[PDB]
Write a protein that binds this ligand. Sequence first.
Ligand code: HEM
Length: 151
Amino acid sequence: VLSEGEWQLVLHVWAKVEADVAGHGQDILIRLFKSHPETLEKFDRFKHLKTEAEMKASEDLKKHGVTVLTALGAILKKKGHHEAELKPLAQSHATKHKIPIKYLEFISEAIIHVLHSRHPGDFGADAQGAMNKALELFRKDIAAKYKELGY
Ligand code: HEM
């Protein structure tokens, strides 16, 4: 469980993210797709993209980054009490989109990297550690729902 001090670190950097949700979502998805090309393939919307420049030029990719980061921000602000927010997400991701937990680990890495690049002064090691714990908690809870569903 995260402590109150850890949640404060998480939400302090997250408030910086929310000044530019779309730009952060672009950066995160591009990093994910470049670092882990199998993830791109899960998106019929995006698997035509062949280059970073094409990814950066795609308005639809920017829209999905907003969708993803909006959902994550709503989860983070629940400070662990995110059961209702995870139910639909775990269901769609296990049974429709088919996103392994490992791919959630990869996007978590991408989130952390982009937050460190964009917000170094608010993303020292303490805050990195807290955000890693928050994203682990997310993954843990989704994983339990996947297991229930046999995914
Ligand atoms: C922080 C982690 C993530 C969050 C919060 C998140 C959130 C969302 C949301 C809110 C939606 C739309 C509602 C829904 O279908 O449930 C969605 C759709 C989707 N997401 Fe996730 N997502 C995350 C990670 C990923 C990863 C890592 C992948 C792939 C590697 C992925 C693949 C997809 C796909 C394929 C869709 C459907 C897109 C479409 O065809 O419109 N997501 N996601």
